[PDB]
Write a protein that binds this ligand. Structure first.
Ligand SMILES: *Cc1cc2c(cc1C)N[C@]1(C(CC=O)c3ccccc3)C(=O)NC(=O)N=C1N2C[C@H](O)[C@H](O)[C@H](O)COP(=O)(O)OP(=O)(O)OC[C@H]1O[C@@H](n2cnc3c(N)ncnc32)[C@H](O)[C@@H]1O
Ligand SMILES: *Cc1cc2c(cc1C)N[C@]1([C@H](CC=O)c3ccccc3)C(=O)NC(=O)N=C1N2C[C@H](O)[C@H](O)[C@H](O)COP(=O)(O)OP(=O)(O)OC[C@H]1O[C@@H](n2cnc3c(N)ncnc32)[C@H](O)[C@@H]1O
Lengths: 499, 494
């Protein structure tokens, strides 16, 4: 019944908030809708896989808060395999490449690719991390989808195709579904294009030994019976002295403050008395999550390594169910596996098939891409379609359609009386990731510590010391990368000499 | 506890479904979240206004279902005042005009405006009312916003400003927020641009004497205590023999079937056991409602009529709070009033202000547009911001952002086990309107009757005879309107 703070949601963000509050000597309860903690992180354990992450999994340099939290809980990371060649499969044909990015040989196509990525980062520098609506051209960029932007910037189909796949992979949505301002923000708040897409030196470098679900589970161990499983919150009342929070199984909790640690749109599942202020009321109907099936196909051996492929495949084309894969083999070298994402409209399209039919499509794809008949002999298959989760709404995260971020963005973490907002969607650095969940959870907890007079305002927003275990290499450009002209820049140079 | 059908939502759609099932001899219960019925229709009474519609209000020809249902409930209509001249206010100046549409004098601009409305209607003709995702170019049009379409079609800033205002007024959303495919379907399924925007012979022809809120109130009167007020539904369990529907105040209802008669996104307020199927689970997170404040300024007399203005103003620009107005005077000539909509982003921006501040801004606009100091002396003011409503989510209706209609559209009225779907959003003719609400409620009711073996499949979808009181005239075009070239077509011809 009675406590200091009710945390709604027992994913990373809610667990991280409850831990900070508990450590500060406050009585907290966590109310969790599911029969488990972890939310968008979920580690499945059985004999055939040992363990496998079916949700969030990858951590990388600059993600210092999740790395510190997991380290403090006794967790270790290992490196995702990138020793052998990556593959870029384009127009039915595979192009092995060393290094982080697929090489472009045609000089014109090269000027267009270079300019695309450079401009994305150039535009991002204009966007404040903590207030994207404040960018000088916010309105202009928000009233445009990513599709319109790619149509404007990319002077070759090659660049447009790769940029489209990049959008699909980063935000599990179609270029036409998403605001250009929002997507440019999302990339910039992760540290830029390189940092977001890279394995070595980027968001995909590492995973946790034993799975990422251990972060939430181990916080549950520390909190004991303070975590209430199968308590979907249905009702929040702020009319009286103390906040009343009701769950679906008719339990009532009473607190001084509430942290909402759930995807913004899932706030729709709760009835509010008094009603939410107008802007939030409408915002939560405007912020859908992406669509993705995460698929892991298990083999006897990591046969791709023998052919000198690491297992990273960037796969273009409508015919392909999976647009991106990584080696999901255990750090020990066993349970050989390929992890692939079925992204956006394909998640929708292929959900109609059975498990076995999807498995068949993935193997036949991998066989073609890796030039290997062995791909046709899987030993096991696991998958999770996140579109079907009542208490997630999708994965990886919330995207903003055109128009929304400039109109409703400033509401996302604005307190509603005694309700404070966490969840990765409210982060200012790696929002959408496990990293952002920790940031938002800990910041929301500290907003409440401030409200209670226990800390100064200057301590609500805290920087994180850099991990000594996963240090970040800076993102560098070369002279030619900075100053080579765009395609229309080259055309302007041509018409100037011939005049 | 026990009944044949639970209807969730006591708006026009739920009430229409409940009346039909009740009329068939079934035991129905209506579970309504608010302390009132009507939903997006709300009629307020006091001695200053007598009665005023703060939500949905207008009906017109081809809306034969709402007209029939209202007539059966003992309601009468009256005609919205359009006797005198309409006003187009452009670049700080008023241009009065007779006839339905604002005249255009520049020859390039004329061709541009003419081509725009024609192309809209031409595109609509390839879009099936009952399945817009089956349009030949469905994905192409769905992956474009209306702003992109407008940038592509409109060669003049004049045509683009007016087309933008048209989108704003029709769907209370910005051109960049909405799917081209969806908006084109929305117009088509109201009978086309002329039908949707016209007062005489269109959607704004008439109001109900006493208010439209009586539609819901009078069906509640029929149903008596079968309607449960302040019963927000929180939980629907379909794992057992009968369906179990729980409310927030802890009541349990048990039925053979359920009708969901609420805006699709509001289905999110309900926890489902078992979970909804995937496509619906995501669909209901992707479908917001628009933003609008409806504002009514009262005056001692309808002074605009003296200047040969009807009170309808079409007002261009960012500066103006209200882009569109109608005379809201009672048919008797008293309670003189101008109704105006604060649309889309302006509803967000101006909600920051106080009621008095909004009133002042409106009066100053009307004084400018009508060219009258009398506009500065209001006797009363009523307004309702629909954006703040927990159990509506906005007004007028649900809009589809780019990508969604082709991906999720077929999900809208697909039953989930024993849950059938009503609400104006699921209609195929005048969806978004009170008309669509009746169509959908009655169709979802008949789906259940068919699932009960009471009627054949053929009878789920039923045509409506034309209203004898409000007959429709056909929509005509001239030879020149059909064959005059577009701007690029005049250019290609030169
Ligand atoms: C808000 C508004 C709506 C309409 C207009 C104006 C405003 C301010 N105007 C019109 C126009 C529509 C144009 O697209 C219009 C605009 C400009 C020029 C001409 C016309 C109007 O003039 N005519 C018209 O026909 N319709 C208008 N507007 C829309 C209609 O009002 C609307 O379509 C219908 O009222 C919708 O009916 P519905 O039955 O499908 O749905 P709703 O009314 O929302 O009822 C749902 C009820 O459900 C309750 N509820 C929600 N969650 C619940 C839970 N969980 N449990 C139980 N009950 C729940 C809710 O409380 C509602 O009562
Ligand atoms: C689903 C998924 C998520 C992530 C990835 C993959 C999948 C399949 N992958 C990650 C990447 C994100 C990229 O943008 C990524 C992809 C590709 C390459 C590199 C990276 C990943 O690999 N790393 C990573 O850091 N994050 C990934 N993904 C996102 C994370 O999973 C996600 O960001 C965090 O898990 C979010 O944490 P939270 O903010 O705490 O939010 P939830 O997990 O959703 O927890 C909410 C809990 O609330 C409960 N709930 C909901 N409603 C309730 C009510 N009414 N009452 C009580 N409780 C309620 C719900 O059950 C949750 O437990």
């Amino acid at each position: 019944n009675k406590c200091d703070v009710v945390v709604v949601g027992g994913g990373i963000s809610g667990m991280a908030a409850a831990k900070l509050l508990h450590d500060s000597g406050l009585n907290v309860v966590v109310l969790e809708a599911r029969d488990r903690v972890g939310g968008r992180t979920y580690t499945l354990r059985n004999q055939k896989v040992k363990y496998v992450d079916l949700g969030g999994s990858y951590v990388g340099p600059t993600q210092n808060r999740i790395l510190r939290l997991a380290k403090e809980l006794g967790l270790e990371t290992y490196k995702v395999n990138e020793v052998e060649r990556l593959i870029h499969h384009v127009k039915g044909k595979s192009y092995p490449f060393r290094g982080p990015f697929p090489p472009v040989w045609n000089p014109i196509t090269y000027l267009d690719h270079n300019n695309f990525w450079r401009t994305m980062d150039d535009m991002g520098r204009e966007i404040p991390s903590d207030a994207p609506w404040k960018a000088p051209l916010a309105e202009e960029w928000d009233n445009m989808t990513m599709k319109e932007l790619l149509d404007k910037l990319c002077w070759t189909e090659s660049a447009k195709q790769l940029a489209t796949l990049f959008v699909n992979l980063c935000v599990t949505a179609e270029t036409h579904e998403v605001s250009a301002l929002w997507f440019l923000w999302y990339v910039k708040q992760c540290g830029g294009t390189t940092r977001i897409i890279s394995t070595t030196n980027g968001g995909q470098e590492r995973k946790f030994v034993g799975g990422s679900g251990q972060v939430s589970e181990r916080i549950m161990d520390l909190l004991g019976d303070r975590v209430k499983l199968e308590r979907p919150v249905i009702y929040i009342d702020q009319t009286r002295e103390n906040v009343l929070v009701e769950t679906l199984n008719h339990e009532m909790y009473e607190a001084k403050y509430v942290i909402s640690a759930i995807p913004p749109t899932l706030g729709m599942k709760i009835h509010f008395n008094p009603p939410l202020p107008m802007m939030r009321n409408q915002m939560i109907t405007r912020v859908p999550l992406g669509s993705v099936i995460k698929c892991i196909v298990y083999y006897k051996e990591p046969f791709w390594r023998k052919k000198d492929y690491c297992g990273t495949m960037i796969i273009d084309g409508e015919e392909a169910p999976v647009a991106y894969t990584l080696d999901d083999t255990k750090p020990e070298g066993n349970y050989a596996a390929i992890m692939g994402f079925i992204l956006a409209h394909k998640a929708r399209k292929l959900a109609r098939l059975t498990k076995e039919e999807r498995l068949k499509k993935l193997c036949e794809l991998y066989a073609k891409v890796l030039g290997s008949l062995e791909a046709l002999e899987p030993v096991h298959y696991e998958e999770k379609n996140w579109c079907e989760e009542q208490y997630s709404g999708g994965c990886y995260t919330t995207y903003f359609p055109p128009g929304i971020l400039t109109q409703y963005g400033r509401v996302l973490r604005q307190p509603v009386d005694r309700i404070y907002f966490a969840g990765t969607e409210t982060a200012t650095h790696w929002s959408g990731y496990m990293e952002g969940a920790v940031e938002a959870g800990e910041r929301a907890a500290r907003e409440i510590l401030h409200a209670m007079g226990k800390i100064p305002e200057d301590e609500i927003w805290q920087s994180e010391p850099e991990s000594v275990d996963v240090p970040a290499q800076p993102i560098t450009t070369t002279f030619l990368e900075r100053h080579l002209p765009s395609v229309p820049g080259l055309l302007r140079l041509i018409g100037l000499t011939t005049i």
